Amino acid sequence: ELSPVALRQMSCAAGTTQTACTDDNALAYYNTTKGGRFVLALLSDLQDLKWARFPKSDGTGTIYTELEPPCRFVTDTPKGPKVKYLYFIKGLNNLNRGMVLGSLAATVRLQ
Amino acid sequence: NELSPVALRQMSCAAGTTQTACTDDNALAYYNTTKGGRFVLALLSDLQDLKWARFPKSDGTGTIYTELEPPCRFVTDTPKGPKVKYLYFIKGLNNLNRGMVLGSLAATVRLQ
Incomplete structure (x- = not known):
């Protein structure tokens, strides 16, 4: 069926260009x-x-993925609201967009 | 532009195999x-x-009955042990909202 699979998080490099992906x-x-x-x-x-x-x-190599235009949003932080940007993978369907937003609501202090 | 952020709220509710069978x-x-x-x-x-x-x-006027899609079965890990649960989408729910529920569940519950 549509059995839910755990969405995890990890830090990663990103940039304006592929070569720009730095740290x-x-x-x-x-x-x-x-x-x-x-x-x-x-x-x-x-x-x-x-x-x-x-x-x-496995170290076979590295994967580069195009990003959609970001979705700006606000999170609640002890040091005040903070503005973050949410990038969907280019071509991500709405089902997976929903899962992201569902996971984001659970792992981030939205609004 | 600005993203629409919504929190998925949970509430106890009545359900049944028929409309009349909806009581507790x-x-x-x-x-x-x-x-x-x-x-x-x-x-x-x-x-x-x-x-x-x-x-x-x-509004106190009456009652609303919403029909369920076929259930999706999954197992959660609880202190009492694994518990078989069934997830019912509202009849006709679009894919974005379906993902929202599926994304919230997997982000807040341990699955087997």
Whole structure:
């Protein structure tokens, strides 16, 4: 059926270009199925990101994914509201967009 | 531009195999608090044969019955041990809202 699979988070590199992916500057929401991680969305403080870099665990190589235009949103932080940017993977369907938003509501102090 | 952020609220509710069979709180409803009215997305229940959910109207006028999709079965890890649960989407729920419920569940519950 549509059995729910756990959405996990991990830090990851992202940048304006693929070469620009420098050091961990974002947080990736991903799925773990079969052999490999399925990244659904990026979470970051930066608003001009276009790419995300992911090294597979086996070290065979690294994966670059195009990012959609970011969805700006606000989180509640002890030091006051903070503005974050939510990047869906390019071409992400609405079902997986929903799962991201559902997981984001649970792992982040929204509004 | 700005993203629409909604928190999935949960509330105990009545359910049954028929509209008349809806009496006690047999399930918990995932809903959204909108400007006015509660928008129910899905039902979570120990029972696997549910078809309707009942919500007495806030205005006191009557009761609302929303029909259920076929249940999705899954196992949660609880202190009492693994518990078989059944997830019912509201009849006709779009894919975004379905993902919202599926994303909230897997982010807040341990699955087997």
